[PDB]
Amino acid sequence: QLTEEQIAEFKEAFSLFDKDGDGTITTKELGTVMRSLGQNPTEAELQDMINEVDADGNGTIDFPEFLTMMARKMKDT
């Protein structure tokens, strides 16, 4: 899985983009947060990720969802 250090680091990055502190970020920020952590998903990969995480159409990504996407992205690096 992910370590407790990886989770802490991902949470710090995530926190930088949740500027209202409500626990979510917009899907429009996913690429930016991933790039801040050194990942460089293509626009196609990013759009696929967004369609999936945003299946409910609320346009929100929360921290467990971000970890899931990082975890999925790290199985494919």
**Which residues does the annotation place in the binding site for Ca(2+)?**
18, 20, 22, 24, 29, 54, 56, 58, 60, 65
> Which residues inside 17-76 make contact with a copy of itself, applying CB under 8 A?
51-53, 55-58, 60, 63-65, 67-68, 70-72
Q: Which does 20 bind (CB under 5 to 8 A by kind): Mg ion, a copy of itself, none?
A: Mg ion
Smallest separation, CB 59 to Mg ion (Å): 7
What's the Cα-to-Cα distance from 6 to each of 2, 57, 60, 67, rounded to whole Å?
6, 28, 22, 9
Residue 26, contacted partner among a copy of itself, Mg ion, none, CB below 5-8 A by kind: none
- Tell whether residue 58 is a contact of Mg ion (CB under 5 A): yes
Nearest-5° Cα angle at 74, 15 to 68: 50
